[PDB]
């Protein structure tokens, strides 16, 4: 009866956009797997924070399905996610089974690379808008958090808490999200 | 001409309160050393995020002095910081040379354990107030960020961005903090 989350961690990922959702989701009782794109080895994030993943993406792929797949941002991290065939397979499968897909900042540009969720309203970091909108396959939003169907997007490191709590609300409901939120000392 | 920051990382530390200041400070051009209390080995944080430190605290101690010493929160992380003699030596030295000391959430309780900054106005996480105020050696504040002399404190994971930007402003000034802040997409 426990929900499961997959966080895909690639070199150059924004470590704040990786750790906040993982932390907040585990506070909500969600079983989170931080899967290294390139294997089990430690991952050097965009600001040189080094994180040890829980598993390789190859191994975590076999232990699905997941209720949410989370794509952190970071320009170079998002590029690595966009070039990976394993990520394409995971996202297409998740879209087919109508599971939740969550991406923040530059992360949503991986959805375009893999042709995921065309026609959805999405947001990105302001600096990633032009890349996300190449071809006009999505409709752009400036909301700090945007959810259209099974596609949940957010804008930047400073929206990471709202992004993470939106996932919790989608998976575990509004009451759990509010309980998890109070001890964090968030402003609004 | 480069400012230097020391972040002391112990088991049970709150990984969000560790990664946000490190990331934000490196965005500000500050040279940050994430020093493992127990050595160079990876550190399991409070929500099971595993971080590889840049150096052992023993090694980082020799490469001082630092313009700021940063103590993350996390109840068990703060207890480990409070029991460490090496931390006592670093903090007392930092206080004598009138360097900045920054602690967030449960982190400020390590200041009480090591008799640092008595008489200062400080804040903590609401759940750590009673422990911080044992003996009445400080004056308590409910501000999200509190700075009294060389003691800078903050309340919780949700104040981590404001806590980190206050450090940048103290070290590099108000203009740099504002430049670093804009791309984060913070609300206020």
Curated annotation (Swiss-Prot), chains A, B:
Active site feature: 105, 125
Protein's name according to its UniProt entry: Parkinson disease protein 7
Impact after mutating residue 45 to A: Reduces protein stability. No effect on oxidation. Reduced localization in lipid rafts
Family: Belongs to the peptidase C56 family.
Intracellular or extracellular location(s): Cell membrane; Cytoplasm; Nucleus; Membrane raft
Catalytic reaction(s) noted: N(omega)-(1-hydroxy-2-oxopropyl)-L-arginyl-[protein] + H2O = lactate + L-arginyl-[protein] + H(+); N(6)-(1-hydroxy-2-oxopropyl)-L-lysyl-[protein] + H2O = lactate + L-lysyl-[protein] + H(+); S-(1-hydroxy-2-oxopropyl)-L-cysteinyl-[protein] + H2O = lactate + L-cysteinyl-[protein] + H(+); N(omega)-(1-hydroxy-2-oxoethyl)-L-arginyl-[protein] + H2O = L-arginyl-[protein] + glycolate + H(+)
Keyword field contains Coiled coil: no
Recorded superkingdom: Eukaryota
Lineage: Eukaryota, Metazoa, Chordata, Craniata, Vertebrata
SUPFAM superfamilies: Class I glutamine amidotransferase-like
One Gene Ontology cellular component: chromatin
Sites bearing N6-succinyllysine, chain numbering: 181
Effect ascribed to mutating residue 105 to A: Abolishes enzymatic activity. Abolishes oxidation, association with mitochondria and protease activity. No effect on chaperone activity. Reduces binding to OTUD7B. Removes the glycations and restores histone 3
Impact when changing residue 25 to I: In PARK7; does not affect protein stability and degradation; does not interfere with homodimerization; decreased detoxification activity on methylglyocal-adducted CoA
Modified residues (N6-acetyllysine): 147
Tissue specificity: Highly expressed in pancreas, kidney, skeletal muscle, liver, testis and heart. Detected at slightly lower levels in placenta and brain (at protein level). Detected in astrocytes, Sertoli cells, spermatogonia, spermatids and spermatozoa. Expressed by pancreatic islets at higher levels than surrounding exocrine tissues.
UniProt cross-references to InterPro entries, sorted A to Z: Class_I_gatase-like (IPR029062), DJ-1 (IPR006287), DJ-1/PfpI (IPR002818), Prot/Nucl_acid_deglycase (IPR050325)
Effect caused by changing residue 17 to N: Strongly decreases enzymatic activity
Molecular-function annotations in GO: cadherin binding; copper ion binding; cupric ion binding; cuprous ion binding; cytokine binding; DNA-binding transcription factor binding; enzyme activator activity; enzyme binding
The record's account of how the chain is modified after translation: Sumoylated on Lys-129 by PIAS2 or PIAS4; which is enhanced after ultraviolet irradiation and essential for cell-growth promoting activity and transforming activity.
Outcome of mutating residue 45 to A: Reduces protein stability. No effect on oxidation
S-palmitoyl cysteine: lipidated positions: 45, 52, 105
Residues annotated as site: Cleavage: 148-149
Record-linked Gene3D superfamilies: 3.40.50.880
Quaternary context: Homodimer. Binds EFCAB6/DJBP and PIAS2. Part of a ternary complex containing PARK7, EFCAB6/DJBP and AR. Interacts (via N-terminus) with OTUD7B. Interacts with BBS1, HIPK1, CLCF1 and MTERF. Forms a complex with PINK1 and PRKN. Interacts (via C-terminus) with NCF1; the interaction is enhanced by LPS and modulates NCF1 phosphorylation and membrane translocation. Interacts with NENF.
